[PDB]
Design a protein that fits this description.
part of a larger assembly; 5 chains; A: 3-stranded antiparallel sheet; about 35% helix; B: about 425 residues; alpha+beta; Elongation Factor Tu (Ef-tu), domain 3; 4-stranded antiparallel sheet
Chain lengths: ~550, ~425, ~55, ~55, ~50
């Protein structure tokens, strides 16, 4: 019955379910980022040569560069029967608050972890800004998640790759003392009571200091029917506004402003609740956050289910056996070269007794002299001289080195190309666009376009706080994937150039060229050309 | 030498009683701290006076209760030698056989519990196939004794025959020298009917027990004993411990030849109307559930007597017997001959408490555990597998934890044909 | 399969036993007959013998 | 075995669990492996009051 | 996609002009593509 007991039951179930895949993913990350010689603190370990001769890392670098050369971003497009520019405002807002370094870095981190381990992820969060807000004195930013395989535990009963059917999800935060102080400061928690949770790491490297403080954030999605209030817009038409979004703030300010309630329907939607939990108590209970979706976007490589168990893989898991075999064989051969006697003659001491200074290595003599006689045996026994055999690498070692390297080269071929990995990234970006659209509808000031101009209908409460008023006719655009851009002007330039490259030299060619000069950026010479192009378009009507 | 892949199917069991009996799963943490027992209240019966002035005649309130608990897990622990063809094959047929065996064991325990804790006892002096419509007379006797005592048959009733007496009933139906619809069906198929003599379910059960005869003779009640319904009583520490209502320990002259499951009837006592307290003409039948000491037994219907003087009115409202034992009552034994039992009950008198074995927990690392579903019955247990390299043998276990309870032994019954001599 | 009750079941495991039955064939069932070439100018008796053999 | 972070003192240890199927039982072990060394005992000190004969 | 496929097989004639104007008409909306689409719409309306 306890909230903590229910939360911990769910977390324990998911943590136990996702155990094998997480362990393999952590091993792949360690293998491809720290050292291919695993098993630190093996009790039975002496000092022996352990060299790291790498063949998987150039492949991983090649794949990561290939994925980086072809960026993918969200592209909102108008729905069927919607107004032809139903997506311009949302696209502008997305480009505005997703142009920073943080969004790009989060996507890059997730992609690199997808290539190596098999799963990455990132997060979307909403912050308050007063200097450069996207809208409504707020911003939506994207944040990275490092080692998502162990730091994001998804609801077990989710059979979808993007995890859009997951009812809850827990994200584990590990912090040092100062990190915990800042965390408690930012969430208004008690910094004196040190928190604790499941440790998602492993003392697998001799890192001299490891982290000690753990918290968890538990997100849950509740889908229910809630009351909506149908009004009549003082300008024209009838809007629909959620009762919970203006439950106390402006319920009478609407009436004062001139909104008359027409009816009241029950509409089913989802709400997202966050809780800050340690292993002993719940610190924040059900803090409601903006949006309908869990704000975590996962990216996968090779993904599937085997027997009610989710498995994912990157590009490194299959090559590990061959790489480890090659490292071991090269270490054995290095030991052969180091600790093996060299090729030298075998002498009896009496054979060279007295001429011991001829074989030390100097070149002062034209030959070598040997003793011939012994007093008690008449003459020294005659036997051909022997030399210690030269060190040699065994045929087994040579064959195994060649075959292990060949196996690694044969199995470390993602795809034929990264088409499937780019498609999984595109799926993740589409889910990201869905989440961003929901959060925008929740917190941002979305203008409605009239065909009679954008009409932003909002009002302020008695506490000077402004409550946004978004109608229910909000999902006017769907999500596609297109080239990554920084601004709507850049996107328009790309579209005009694409049209230009395909239009033959006629009158639309002139139109498109003048349009490009119109949309071009500003200096002095380009300013002159843009003024001329505007004049020409206007004078051509 | 090696065999083909076609299984010679040899056995096929059916579990009607276990299928029919309801299943109950109380909360796990509460049961763990409660010692795997939980109490349920019994329907309240109220006293009633007649008169005008009732100064100092106000009664109190009383509400008895019963307890349901659990026994021990039923396992199928078995071993898997590494280097064995016979072990590599058939280790899935073994799992299937384990499932069927576990369901069979559940049904067997249900049937044994019903037979050995059924209070209502119907007896006959001769076999079923002797006279005409004798099987119908048996089922009707069960229904009439349940109706006269005003028991709660709201959620259904059931009568289970054994195969021999089912064949006797079918023979009695077909030998009629007539063919309508009931005789035609009992002739084409063996089925007598589904509803017979009032019961809304009349089945044939293949694994009803055999109630061996009781050698007890010449036993008498030793001292007058009055049984009083209570909801709790104080222990040595002053703590009030709950008192179970479906048992009563009684001292006799000598309990020799008695065992758990014999049906007795004291000479003189009679059933009541329960609700109206109208004396019946049928002798009260009890069932002994435990033989403790050499002079004590535990009988499942507590004989609360109507003529008792030491009973407060709120206790007398629960009376079920016309008079109390009186230090000389000869106790007759109703099972004077071996016979396989027929069992009738109200459908809400037997329940199956069930608990999980949380072996999925992280403390049990190294072993792999799945939910195991035994068929027919609605029971889930665990299926665990581990293995020790010391003996190089995987160990596979199947566990499932339940407890069969008779919450209302006054509704369960036992039919005993041919109880002569 | 067998069964056992309790929590502690150390050294109480059982092995596995699967049994077999054997199915085989026996003597072929035949029908012989010999005819001379002159006796097949009609063939009716030959055809009827084949049918009756079946 | 999994990691198990001892708070308060900045240390980590091993949380290791095992299961027995012949009893349906389990064991948990929380182990901290450390060692205290006094590298500069000429710098370590001790103050003792009331040290009269 | 259908208009592009037709354009890819029709030679540079009056149907080619009609299909180019149609493809401009069926474009998404920004500002410049809005101007181009309005131009294509007006040309198609005027051409009857």
């Amino acid at each position: 019955e306890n909230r903590l007991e229910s939360i911990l039951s769910r977390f324990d179930a998911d943590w136990t379910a996702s155990d094998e895949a997480r362990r393999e993913a952590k091993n792949d990350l360690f293998f491809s980022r720290v050292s291919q010689w695993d098993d630190w603190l093996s009790q039975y370990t002496t000092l022996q040569y352990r060299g790291q001769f790498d063949v998987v890392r150039p492949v991983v670098r090649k794949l990561v560069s290939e994925m980086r050369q072809n960026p993918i971003d969200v592209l909102y497009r108008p729905k069927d029967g919607a107004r032809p520019d139903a997506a311009d405002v949302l696209m502008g807002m997305y480009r505005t608050d997703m142009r920073h370094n943080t969004a790009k870095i989060a996507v890059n981190i997730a992609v690199r972890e997808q290539i190596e381990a098999g799963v990455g992820a990132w997060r979307l969060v909403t912050d308050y800004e007063d200097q450069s807000p996207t809208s409504n004195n707020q911003v939506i930013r994207r944040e990275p998640i490092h080692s998502a395989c162990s730091h994001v535990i998804w609801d077990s009963n989710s059979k979808l790759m993007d995890k859009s059917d997951a009812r809850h999800c827990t994200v584990i935060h590990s912090m040092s003392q100062n990190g915990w102080e800042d965390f408690a400061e930012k969430y208004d928690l008690d910094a004196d009571d040190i928190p604790s949770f499941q440790n998602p790491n492993d003392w697998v490297f001799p890192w001299l200091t490891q982290d000690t403080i753990q918290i968890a954030e538990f997100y849950e999605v509740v889908e229910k029917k809630e009351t909506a209030f149908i009004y009549q817009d003082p300008v024209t038409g009838e809007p629909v506004s959620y009762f919970k979004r203006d439950i106390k703030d402006v319920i009478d300010d609407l009436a004062d402003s001139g909104f008359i309630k027409i009816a009241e329907r029950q509409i089913k939607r989802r709400r997202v609740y966050k809780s800050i939990i340690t292993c002993t108590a719940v610190l924040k209970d059900k803090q409601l956050i903006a949006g309908e979706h869990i704000p975590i976007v996962p990216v996968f490589g090779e993904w599937g289910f085997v027997e009610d168990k989710e498995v994912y893989e990157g590009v490194v898991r299959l090559t590990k056996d061959g790489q480890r075999l090659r490292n071991m064989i090269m270490s054995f051969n290095a030991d052969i070269v180091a600790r093996t006697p060299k090729k030298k003659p075998f002498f009896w001491p009496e054979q060279i007794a007295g001429f011991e200074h001829m074989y030390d290595g100097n070149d002062d003599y034209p030959y070598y002299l040997l003793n011939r006689t012994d007093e008690n045996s008449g003459d020294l026994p005659t036997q051909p001289l022997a030399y210690y055999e030269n060190p040699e690498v065994p045929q087994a070692n040579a064959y195994m080195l060649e075959a292990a390297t060949s196996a690694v080269k044969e199995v470390a071929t993602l795809g034929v190309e990264t088409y499937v990995f780019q498609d999984n990234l595109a799926t993740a970006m589409r889910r990201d666009g869905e989440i961003y659209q929901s959060i925008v509808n929740d917190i941002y000031d979305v203008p409605r376009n009239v065909t009679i101009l954008m009409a932003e209908v909002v009002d302020l409460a008695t506490g000077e706080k402004q409550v946004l008023n978004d109608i229910r006719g909000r999902y006017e655009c769907y999500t596609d994937v297109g080239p990554s851009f920084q601004s709507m002007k850049q996107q328009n330039r790309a579209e005009i150039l694409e049209l230009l490259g395909k239009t033959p030299q006629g009158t639309p060619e002139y139109q498109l060229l003048l349009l490009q000069y119109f949309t071009l950026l500003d200096g002095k010479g380009v300013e002159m050309m843009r003024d001329y192009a505007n004049k020409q378009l206007i004078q051509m009507g | 030498t090696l065999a083909v892949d076609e299984i010679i199917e040899t056995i096929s069991a059916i579990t009607p009683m276990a299928q029919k009996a309801k299943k109950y799963t109380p909360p796990a943490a509460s049961m763990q701290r409660s010692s795997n027992t939980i109490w349920m209240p019994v329907e309240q019966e109220s006293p009633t006076q007649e008169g005008w002035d009732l100064t100092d005649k106000a009664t109190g309130l009383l509400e008895l209760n019963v307890a349901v608990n659990m026994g021990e897990p039923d396992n199928d622990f078995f071993q898997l030698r590494a280097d064995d063809l016979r072990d590599e094959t058939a280790y899935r047929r073994r799992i299937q056989s384990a499932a069927r065996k576990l369901a069979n064991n559940v049904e067997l325990k249900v049937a044994n519990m019903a037979a050995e804790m059924g209070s209502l006892v119907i007896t006959s002096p001769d076999a079923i196939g002797t006279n005409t419509a004798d099987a119908w007379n048996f089922v009707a006797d069960a229904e009439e004794i349940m109706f006269s005592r005003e028991l709660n048959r709201d959620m259904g009733t059931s009568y289970f025959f054994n195969p021999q007496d089912y064949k006797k009933a079918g023979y009695d139906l077909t030998k009629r020298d007539i063919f309508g619809r009931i005789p035609e069906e009992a002739y084409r198929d063996g089925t007598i009917q589904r509803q017979v003599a009032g019961f809304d379910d009349v089945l044939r059960s293949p694994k009803l027990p055999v109630l061996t005869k009781s050698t007890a003779t010449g036993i008498t009640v030793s001292g007058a004993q009055s049984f009083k319904p209570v909801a709790w009583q104080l222990d040595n520490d002053g703590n009030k411990v709950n008192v179970d209502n479906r048992f009563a320990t009684v001292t006799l002259s000598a309990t020799t030849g008695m065992k758990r499951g014999d049906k007795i009837s004291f000479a003189g006592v009679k059933f009541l109307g329960q609700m109206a307290k109208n004396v019946l003409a049928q002798d009260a039948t009890f069932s002994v559930v435990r033989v403790v000491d050499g002079t004590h037994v535990e009988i499942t219907p507590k004989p609360v007597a109507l003529d008792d003087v030491s009973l407060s009115p709120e206790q007398r409202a629960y009376a079920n017997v016309n008079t109390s034992l009186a230090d000389a009552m000869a106790v007759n034994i109703l099972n004077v001959k071996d016979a396989r039992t027929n069992v009738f009950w109200a459908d809400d008198a037997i329940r199956i408490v069930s608990q999980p074995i949380p072996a999925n927990h992280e403390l049990f690392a190294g072993m792999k555990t799945t939910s195991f579903s035994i068929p027919d019955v609605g029971l889930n247990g665990i299926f665990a597998t581990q293995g020790d390299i010391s003996t190089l043998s995987g160990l596979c276990r199947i566990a499932l934890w339940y407890g069969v309870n008779a919450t209302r032994p006054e509704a369960i019954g036992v039919g005993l044909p041919g109880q002569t001599a």
